[PDB]
From Swiss-Prot, chains A, B, C, D, E, F:
Similarity comment: Belongs to the Leviviricetes capsid protein family.
Organism: Escherichia phage MS2 (Bacteriophage MS2)
Outcome reported for the amino acid change (mutating P78A): No effect on the organization of the T=3 capsid, but with a loss of thermal stability. Complete loss of infectivity
GO biological process terms on file: negative regulation of viral translation; regulation of translation
Source taxonomy: Viruses, Riboviria, Orthornavirae, Lenarviricota, Leviviricetes
Protein name: Capsid protein
Mutagenesis / variant outcome for changing E76A: No effect on the organization of the T=3 capsid, but with a loss of thermal stability. No effect on infectivity
Length: 129, 129, 129, 129, 129, 129
RNA sequence: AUGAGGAUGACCCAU
RNA sequence: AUGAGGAUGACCCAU
RNA sequence: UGAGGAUGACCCA
RNA sequence: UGAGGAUGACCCA
């Protein structure tokens, strides 16, 4: 089941959706980027490895561009001022079955669901209170 | 207001749903745990820090346990066979507006949506190909 | 949600009630103080820590002041003639479920219920006999 | 007259109530134990001493056991899987009158009354937040 | 009386008012920010501590954005050129009663009232003369 | 003009109003005191300095006294039981226009307005919760 | 320069 | 600060 | 650990 | 004294 296909990263109900597509596969690290310059693109990378004898580990990185007052195709410096970096590390014991793993995916989905604490804090430039 | 509220971490259609509640805010680290013995509980922690002069960093951690009943010293104890750990760090520039942050939240949601590449690989115990 | 709120420490019918309110939550130590002169105020502090691999430990402290006025050089100040110090430590293994914890709390409330041995000895400047 | 009597430590309606009864009063230390196996019993001890010239100090201790059966070599014994330990010290100046003492007792009962911050945190395996 | 609620920081008679709302409570330090990027937001933080045996101390910090020629949602450097920092430290002796403290609040209100020397000097980019 | 004028520091409706007047400008520090013995007077000081190449810093200090009559050496002297100290530093960039500065003054006024969070906490001898 | 550093208060301390 | 560094998990390691 | 003291988030064996 | 540990009337600084 080849899963290295393009998908919708940011969904705005069909209109203004951000699609990210396969762009690199060097070293088993899969990469997806949006149709932009690499300085203003949405980037996603993913890889898996046996971190130790007892665990496997997925490393997922996401890069999101600052859009407000952005100049499409322009040179915007400093780079650090225009990009956000998401860095995810998922450690799963080798005993985890397919079912166990489905549960783990759901926990991640639940964590970021709309209206829940964490995503609400992030979207409002806040912390917890 | 107050975003420090309980929420559903694992959704199984209102039955066997893993719901998590606020349990501690000591040292600026917001904590949530499920109704279980501290040894078998799901745990979620969050904290925001001004990592740099121009950055803010969210550090989020989730612990998914595999519940079991061990028999140490010929006695039964509620324990965890093993634990899966999710570790994410999100660095956001201070110049990001609320709408810029909403864009990051949506990207994270789209990333883990059912059927998309990454959650599919994780749930099937495989890599991206 | 939040339990770091104001509450009635001493209940005297509805009036003369001593209420203690949040004042500080620095370094994992929550603190409650009663209104007016800090010098004549009631104080309550609380904290929890993983005392060891299997134990979590609560450290609770209460201070009951003896309100008085100090005159010196014809200058009077609101002070506490003296203070009574309550100091308790509660150790709970990580295997304790919410039910086990509820039982522990009932034990503490029973220990101090009116008419029982200990609260009666204390209330009468006495010991056991 | 005597306050070294039996009393209800844990109140569960009228049945399932945990009663603790006198067992020993050696060396100024009063001790109460619940019926049946000493190994699975609840324990409460109390003592008072002149800690200094101006202070008298009460030292109270409670033990809540986790009842369980231990099997070894096919030989089972009634034991406590683990124990929760309550430990409190109350210091009271010799100037405190019976009224002052009654106030101190109300403070302790208020601190642990249902719904209040501390008994709620404990009952839920939580801290303050 | 939960006082950690939103309030109007800059009042322009209903039209164009700047409201600041709860955004963080890490370490007992309360934080309020306006609905902006954190680089252009109005920020307010407050905390209290026992500075010494004789005093308590409120530390209040306010950050005000430079608005003239501002680009909403834009990246404006250097940060020091676009922000003003207010740093307040209020030391109150433990003997101060609620009344004493009300007087202290009034002194602060009087200090900054319209038409008075200090606020007039500040609003006109002047000193005293 | 000349903004160095007397003003009402504490307003109690034209009766018992603490009014403060110009008393010294030595060393670039504007001083105001109330009509009292220098030992029992309210004191307000202000000074502006070009703290940096691109900053100006206002340093404001207010002293609220608790008046009393001490009897040193068997003689009566007008003195202060204790003093409360307000210490504020305001750093404003040189690029701030007059309208930018008016915005800072309004923020400080809104901050201390009756009924708002901070002045409420201070007047009640509590923290923010 | 920075400190939710301290003060008796136009001073002191740490970096 | 950086690591498709590790973990028993608000900790540890390398640079 | 302490039926160790305390001017109580400190101190002693 | 200790928001020091405990197999809780013991033990550590």
């Amino acid at each position: 089941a080849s899963n290295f296909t393009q998908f919708v990263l940011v969904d705005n109900g069909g209109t203004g959706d951000v699609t990210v597509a396969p762009s690199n596969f060097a070293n088993g690290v899969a990469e997806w980027i949006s149709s932009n310059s690499r300085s203003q693109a949405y980037k996603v990378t993913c890889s898996v490895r046996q971190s130790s004898a007892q665990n496997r580990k997925y490393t997922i990185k996401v890069e999101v561009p600052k859009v407000a007052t952005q100049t499409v195709g322009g040179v915007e410096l400093p780079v650090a001022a225009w990009r956000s970096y998401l860095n995810m590390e998922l450690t799963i014991p080798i005993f985890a079955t397919n079912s166990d793993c489905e549960l783990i995916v759901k926990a991640m989905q639940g964590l970021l669901k709309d209206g829940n604490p964490i995503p609400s804090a992030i979207a409002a430039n806040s912390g917890i209170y």
